[PDB]
Design a protein around this ligand. Structure first.
Ligand SMILES: [Ca+2]
Ligand SMILES: [Ca+2]
Lengths: 94, 94, 95
């Protein structure tokens, strides 16, 4: 599992959401941030190793405009994910 | 050392806070996020490996309602925690 | 490549921004958070190279500290890669 954090332009949320849905990603977290100011949107998703490259490419395509200030995507390790409702703990290790 | 971040229903803040305090956890960071939507709160804490299971369990018990949309908890590696007031840096191998 | 997350007193933003600028740090994301009772804080996120971490943390602490309880925390974690959205360039850093 990897955490994918995309800092995008606010108006790119919808096409990014569509790109994620069509990519099989269920669930994402969004928050407002200031990118140094310019208002930006932080999107957080945690996906399996196999779909990381695919998601990033979909995210880049959807969030891209071509001009300066398009943002960045950060990829970081996540050991486990726990579903609160059931207490189900999923751990992925190399 | 692990970063434990929980995305919970906003009305679960107080009970999660209580659970965390009773569990010996001192200090948490709370941010407002939108979970795709519904308003959610992101709770961040950092703890030693030997506390993770216990902390996650208290977190699940406190944040759950049994209804779909209870949220999730992500466990990830943290290299260091620095206390700004004292400048003390606490580092652990990942 | 490390993620540096600093939770600081809101009024320390400008000092921290200045510290990071003359430290060669370009780009940071800032958000409002509550540090627990509740106290308004600012979350500053930056991703720097391994060789910059120690220096950046030192500058951050010097900038954000007051000496009073509640000055905040800085969490340092691993980042596998950084992808520039515009060009699609994936940057990885290792040793
Ligand atoms: Ca749009
Ligand atoms: Ca409650």
């Amino acid at each position: 599992m990897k955490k994918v954090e995309a800092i995008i332009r606010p108006f790119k949320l919808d096409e990014v959401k569509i790109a994620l849905v069509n990519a099989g990603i269920v669930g994402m977290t969004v928050s407002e941030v200031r990118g140094f100011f310019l208002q930006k949107l932080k999107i957080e998703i945690v996906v399996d190793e196999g779909q990381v490259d695919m998601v990033v490419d979909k995210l880049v395509s959807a969030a891209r405009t071509g001009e300066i200030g398009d943002g960045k995507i950060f990829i970081s390790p996540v050991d486990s994910v726990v579903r609160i409702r059931t207490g189900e703990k999923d751990t992925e290790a190399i």
